[PDB]
Amino acid sequence: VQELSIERLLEMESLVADPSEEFQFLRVGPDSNVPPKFRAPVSSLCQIGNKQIAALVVWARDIPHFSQLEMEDQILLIKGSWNELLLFAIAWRSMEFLTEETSPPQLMCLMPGMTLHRNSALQAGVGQIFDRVLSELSLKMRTLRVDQAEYVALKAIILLNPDVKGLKNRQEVEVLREKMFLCLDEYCRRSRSSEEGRFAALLLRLPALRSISLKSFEHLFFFHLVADTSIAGYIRDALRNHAPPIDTN
Amino acid sequence: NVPPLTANQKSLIARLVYYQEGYEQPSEEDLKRVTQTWDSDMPFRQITEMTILTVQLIVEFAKGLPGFSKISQSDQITLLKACSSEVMMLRVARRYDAATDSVLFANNQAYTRDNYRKAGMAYVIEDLLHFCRCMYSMMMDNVHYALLTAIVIFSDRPGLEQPSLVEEIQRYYLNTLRVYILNQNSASPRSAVIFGKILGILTEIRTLGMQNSNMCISLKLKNRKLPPFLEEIWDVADVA
């Protein structure tokens, strides 16, 4: 029995998952309105998303007191957070590729080996989402000087959402999110004592992340890239069958 | 002990609760005017007519809000367009009756399960009722609710000319809510929890505001007549 804290969540970032089992959360599918010329690139990007979705489930599973939740609720929390947690990780990685400290940012870190260029997003018609990710999230967190402790705490608050529809034990999810609110306020008060609006400033990025996440689904569903009928089952099988994370000493 | 509320913050709280109570209920004179503009189409009319009236009350509340005059006219319309649907979700959720598990709007004829099922939007009311039950469990007083409403209006929206200015105005209401929760709870550790759960509503009303935009587009595709004031305030495209 361990305590849900920022210190434990920081240790969980070092753990790397073995994605030996792959689940097709995002796939091109038949009769795709994606032009065939760009169909192979979109499929590649979907397989990259699926890998990061799989590593996201392994991370959520080892969060303290997350396994003690009902398996129905564990599926619902990951089902309603994977898109927002993906964009939040993309924005966190994209902070390094920012221009300077009047041209808009041009690079976005899909993955450590990936940068999606702004012109490619404009051709795909997702340039508006592209810029919001880099401005409302990446650039704002650089201005807010967000460290990894606050970043991993916001990740837990995004996942542990008691307002998820269909939960069996809502109040069990509340206690975990309420504990993360206490951990976040304590870190903001001892580190940056002068900044008294930082606790709200960090949390004000979550509504911005939601609006961006919902807009991504509109493009994802318009191109029939999501298999929503099978996502709930993939998380169930990933929570049970995926191997424990590898550790870096 | 606990940092107290300043004279500016105590007056702002008293001002917000004062005017939000005046716009809780629509005016009887404006009640009959919006109906004279335009198979029964009665459930769809009552829901839209009450939405027009309540949105009009939201704009009047937002225009008389401290800081709304400091921003440009183009930024005023941008904030009014975005917060209209989301504040509507707070107005309706504020009138949730736990005993009957429904929305009691005194009129009690628009926001009902029966009118939404007859208007074809049977799936929508259950998503609204879930947000009503979730927000009802928070037990916000009129101060939490009024300060939250102002925080919604001065939120960072896409297409703002002066985002740094609106952010300073929003922070002026956030700190009022923060100190109010501190004095209310005697600086107990739970002050951040109550302050955090209120800020969590900002995230959830983004989804409901997005569902309203998708519903307005679906109604425009099915050739169902949406009122003109609601089509302009939310930028509903005349789509085929």
Ligand SMILES: C/C=C/CC/C=C\CC/C=C/CCCCCCC(=O)OC[C@H](COP(=O)(O)OCCN)OC(=O)CCCCCCC/C=C/C/C=C/CCC
């Ligand atoms: C939150 C989850 C994140 C995981 C995202 C990973 C994979 C999902 C797919 C993402 C695609 C981003 C676009 C990358 C460029 C693709 C190559 C390209 O130039 O296509 C142009 C084409 C123009 O065609 P056309 O103009 O119709 O045809 C022209 C003539 N044939 O565009 C297309 O063919 C359609 C592409 C479908 C894009 C779906 C966007 C969904 C985005 C989700 C979140 C990511 C946001 C960052 C975006 C940069």
Ligand SMILES: COc1cccc(C(=O)NN(C(=O)c2cccnc2OC)C(C)(C)C)c1C
């Ligand atoms: C999740 O809840 C949703 C989701 C999607 C659409 C609606 C809706 O019914 N919206 N409409 C209203 O009149 C209305 C009623 C109550 C409150 N807010 C409203 O609008 C902001 C239409 C203009 C008729 C579409 C609602 C209530």
Ligand SMILES: [Mg+2]
């Ligand atoms: Mg006022």
